Design a protein around this nucleic acid. Structure first.
Lengths: 135, 141, 57, 59, 188, 141, 87, 93
RNA sequence: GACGGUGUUCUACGGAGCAAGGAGGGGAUGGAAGAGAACAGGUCCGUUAUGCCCUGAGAUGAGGCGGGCUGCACGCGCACUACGAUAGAUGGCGCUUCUGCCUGCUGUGAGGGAUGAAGCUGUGUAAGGGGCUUCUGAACGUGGAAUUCCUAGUAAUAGCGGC
């Protein structure tokens, strides 16, 4: 959409993060308190509710590009792997975290199907409420 | 500092016959045991319900009695099966998580059971030679 | 301390071309004087001293 | 390393002896002449025959 | 529309009290950050076209685990100039020029003879060499004081300048200059 | 509609600046206004040009800059040049051009390479060593 | 033919310090409050050395008596924070 | 719609064929006596000079540069004096 | 069509330094190239290049299957990863871009990551060689005499292509 570049991207993430927790419709992974978010990591996320700050990270940029696939998401949340007595390399996130957020949004009726535009009017109307609140 | 930090702490703590340091945070302090790293110790302290941000020295007997029993079998607190260091044993077939004094007794039986059948990997592993594909001509002296 | 402005560059004569002979001209009372310096000196430069009693050549 | 070889010096003296009164004391003029008179190919060679001539002229 | 080197500190009233080092300390090229890619600083006479606050920053990206970190050295200088300001009440750009002056020697000792006539002579030092030795002693006392201690690099920079601009005997830069000068006058 | 366009390049970065004329001052690098920019080098290198050519000479322009390829410090030096050689191309056509000739003198005493392009170029690599000048380590015995 | 000088003649880890305090008692917290209010620059390192306490605890002492006390933050990075006392 | 395409390895004999066909097609059905000049194509290989393992080890890279021009002139039955050139690789589609 | 051309300071009239103007400045940059001699330098394991000797059916020829070239008391040459706060961990921002930037925890063996255990998997006729998950967690506290490479978009740091 337009106007999503005018708001500070760290306050948008906190403005529909607390909004998502107050609907009780999202269901996290099979277990998200025990796993580390990728193969190039060593320890689990320090925060307790990374799964909601991680979903609103995907919903900001589902509205910039307009269509997200389950391979760009793994490729965008990677890290540097420590390979010991060798030099390090770049690996992406688990392909399982990125698709479980593309179905929570679908069941709530936000992203439709489309490969060139993934948002319904109920999604565009909701996102436009957070833009106008954190000017 | 009204309530940010405590006023007095115990300097020593005894769990599973090892003296935990009582001035560190909880998930780090349990790594003095042998069999507990920082990646499974912080999972037990999250299913139980312990506060991650609290020194181990300041704990009642209720907590130290709970988590000292969760460490025996972690499959009862609810951690998956792919997290234990000893799955699907070759002698009976049951998964478990050996800890402390039961670690060094487990491989010491492997080396002995393998010499009766005169294996080769159990003769090299007994006198300290490299058992995986490494080349022993310039390194390892 | 004293001063002086280099006005002639005689030559570079060190153990391994390190020092460079020079001809200073004291300013509180005009007096030419020879002297050996260590850094990359040019003409017109003004060096310091802390005693002006040697000529080196 | 700005020395001029013999083929480029030996040529500028042949030019300063035959077409001498056609030359004056600016680079942009003497270059126009050596394009008229000589027949070389390299554009770097005329640029140096013309630059050596303007020094010969004011000498 | 005047330029202050971090939007707070002015370049006038930064008078260099000396007279031989004045044409060699460049407070002339101003900017609101000590970062300027140029070509006019190459050459045998381009050593006097580097700003003075840039000579001191690029002395800190050493020991090649830190090669080429110039933005991280510029960040650590914003904070050291805050401590120098609120603590001593004077211009932080003007106490760095007083340290370079009170920490560069004025005479050294050289060799002449060959193995039987090895003779410690005495020489003076031209200005441009007197600044390469000042900058290198200030930064080598800042790297020692931070290696394995619990102190931060921006506080190890502040203590080293507020002590060298007063000749306080707590500075690694000034105690190291007084051996050079005392020794260099005993061989004479 | 009054508009111009310019180009800046530093190493292999390339930027463009479209300069219209509305009645308010503004900047927008890559669609982000000039208040949420986080590059503190992009704010210090781009607001010492607004002090070397005074503010009053630009009160009613709005620049839109772009830069999509290259490193990080190089990208600044490309935005910084398309923005400076657009305050002149504007004063050449729609303003007093004797007012374009003196601020062009004020920008050149500051630095010649905020209007012209640096020509320094990366050197190739030669065999027998890891770079252009360095060689591999020799051994004498 | 024999490693005889490649062996390192060194020492045993030149002596260490005592562990630093991790508890803050009330009487010393009121001593930190004694002279921390007439200072120009106070960092978490200047505090953790006069009283010998872990530098992660030395800042919670400053955050606490910054809410109602005399100090107040004047700048903060991820690698430093300074508290200027309000005399 | 005629479309003449050229390609060859040496260039001092591709310019001749693109100038000798300049005049024998001037006074004909077509006009616009010009030929586009695309950017060349390159193929590289790098190898060792030493035919065994002795000496200093020395490398050398070879190139196969290929020039190519284009022609676009619509006519109707206007040739075989194009097929009489030794090195240029004529193409007529 | 950039020539030390113009000005300037020295010259043996061969040329050299420093300035301005300039998209480019002092062999415009980096390469490629490189007479005629020498060495008993290297290659017969590169070649249906080659003299002489050797070998000839239970062949010193041609195939197929297993083993080895990877064995390990010890001496040496080139490298990769480290010995920490100018840092490590975890998140956010940049995308078909990048090797960066901001950051709640750690105040010190949470630095380092060798060696070995149990369980899951890819290529292939054949693999405890190659990857992944939990555990184990060495030596190492910036290195003796000696010694190598380097003059600017270079040295050093962090990486991506191809063969």
């Amino acid at each position: 959409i337009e106007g999503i570049y005018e708001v500070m991207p760290e306050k948008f993430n906190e403005a529909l993060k607390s909004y998502l927790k107050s609907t009780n419709e999202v269901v996290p992974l099979q277990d998200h308190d025990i796993m580390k978010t990728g193969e190039g990591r060593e320890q689990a996320p320090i925060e307790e509710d990374w799964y909601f700050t991680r979903m609103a990270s995907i919903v900001r940029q589902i509205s910039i590009k307009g269509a997200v696939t389950s391979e760009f998401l793994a490729k965008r949340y990677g890290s540097l792997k420590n390979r010991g007595c060798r030099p390090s390399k770049y690996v992406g996130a688990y392909p399982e975290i990125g698709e479980s957020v593309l179905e929570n949004l679908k069941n709530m009726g936000w992203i439709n199907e489309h490969p060139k535009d993934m948002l319904t009017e109920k999604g565009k109307t909701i996102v436009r409420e957070i833009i106008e609140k954190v000017r | 500092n009204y309530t940010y930090d405590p006023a007095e702490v115990q300097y020593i703590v005894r769990i599973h016959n090892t003296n935990i340091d009582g001035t560190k945070r909880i998930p780090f302090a349990l790594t003095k045991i042998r069999g507990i790293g920082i990646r499974i110790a912080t999972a037990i302290c999250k299913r139980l319900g312990i506060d991650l941000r609290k020194r181990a020295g300041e704990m009642g007997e209720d907590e130290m009695k709970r988590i000292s029993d969760a460490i025996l079998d972690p499959a009862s607190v609810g951690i998956p099966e792919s997290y234990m260091n000893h799955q699907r044993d070759i002698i009976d077939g049951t998964t478990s998580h050996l800890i402390g004094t039961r670690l060094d007794a487990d491989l010491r039986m492997m080396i002995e059971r393998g010499k009766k059948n005169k294996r080769i990997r159990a003769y090299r592993l007994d006198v300290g030679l490299k058992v995986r594909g490494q080349r022993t001509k310039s390194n390892g002296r | 301390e004293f001063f002086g402005e280099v006005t002639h560059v005689l030559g570079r004569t060190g153990g391994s071309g390190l020092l460079t002979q020079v001809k200073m001209e004291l300013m509180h009372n005009k007096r030419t004087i020879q002297r050996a310096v260590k850094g990359p000196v040019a003409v017109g430069d003004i060096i310091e001293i802390l005693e002006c009693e040697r000529e080196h050549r | 390393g700005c020395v001029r070889n013999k083929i480029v010096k030996r040529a500028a003296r042949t030019i300063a002896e035959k077409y001498f009164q056609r030359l004056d004391s600016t680079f942009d003029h003497n270059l126009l002449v050596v394009q008229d008179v000589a027949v070389v190919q390299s554009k770097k060679l005329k640029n140096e025959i013309a630059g050596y001539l303007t020094s010969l002229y004011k000498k | 529309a005047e330029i202050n080197l971090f939007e707070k500190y002015s370049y006038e009233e930064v008078k260099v009290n000396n007279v031989s080092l004045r044409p060699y300390i460049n407070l002339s090229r101003r900017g609101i950050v000590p970062h300027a890619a140029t070509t006019i600083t190459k050459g045998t006479t381009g050593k006097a076209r580097i700003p003075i606050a840039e000579r001191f920053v690029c002395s800190l990206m050493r020991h090649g685990r830190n090669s080429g970190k110039k933005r991280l050295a510029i960040n650590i200088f914003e904070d050291a100039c805050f401590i120098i300001h609120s603590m001593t009440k004077k211009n932080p750009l003007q106490v760095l020029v007083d340290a370079i002056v009170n920490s560069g020697p004025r005479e050294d000792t050289a060799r002449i003879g060959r193995a039987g006539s090895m003779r410690r002579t005495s020489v003076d030092v031209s200005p441009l060499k007197r600044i390469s030795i000042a900058i290198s002693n200030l930064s080598a006392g800042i790297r020692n004081a931070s290696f394995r201690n619990r102190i931060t690099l921006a506080e190890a920079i502040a203590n080293e300048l507020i002590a060298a601009s007063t000749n306080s005997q707590n500075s690694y830069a000034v105690n190291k200059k007084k051996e050079i000068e005392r020794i260099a006058q005993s061989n004479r | 509609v009054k508009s111009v366009t310019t180009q800046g390049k530093k190493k292999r970065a390339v930027a463009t600046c479209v300069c219209t004329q509305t009645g308010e001052f503004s900047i927008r690098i890559n669609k982000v206004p000039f208040k949420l920019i986080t590059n503190t080098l992009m704010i210090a290198k781009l607001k010492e040009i607004i002090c070397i050519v005074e503010q009053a000479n630009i009160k009613d322009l709005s620049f839109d800059i772009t830069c999509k390829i290259g490193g990080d410090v190089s990208r600044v030096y490309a935005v910084r040049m398309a923005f400076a050689k657009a305050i002149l191309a504007f004063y050449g056509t729609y303003f007093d051009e004797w007012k374009k000739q003196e601020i062009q003198k004020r920008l050149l005493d500051f630095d010649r390479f905020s209007l012209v392009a640096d020509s320094r170029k990366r050197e190739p690599k030669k065999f027998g060593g890891p770079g252009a000048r360095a060689r591999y380590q020799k051994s004498y015995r | 033919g024999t490693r005889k000088d490649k062996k390192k003649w060194g020492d045993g880890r030149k002596k260490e310090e005592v562990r630093r305090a991790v508890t803050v008692s009330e009487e010393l917290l009121a001593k930190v409050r004694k002279d921390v209010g007439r200072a120009s620059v106070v960092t978490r390192y200047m505090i953790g050395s006069r009283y010998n306490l872990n530098l992660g605890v030395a800042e919670n002492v400053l955050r606490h008596l910054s809410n109602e006390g005399v100090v107040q933050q004047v700048l903060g990075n991820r690698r430093m924070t300074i508290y200027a006392g309000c005399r | 719609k005629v479309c003449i395409d050229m390609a060859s390895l040496e260039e001092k004999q591709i310019n001749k064929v693109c100038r000798e066909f300049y005049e024998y097609g001037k006074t004909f059905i077509d006009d616009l006596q010009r030929e586009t000049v695309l950017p060349k194509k390159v193929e590289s290989i790098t190898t060792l000079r030493n035919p065994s393992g002795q000496g200093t080890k020395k490398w050398s890279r070879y190139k196969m540069i290929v020039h190519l021009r284009n022609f676009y002139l619509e006519a109707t039955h206007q040739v075989q004096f194009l097929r009489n050139f030794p090195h240029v690789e004529i193409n007529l589609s």
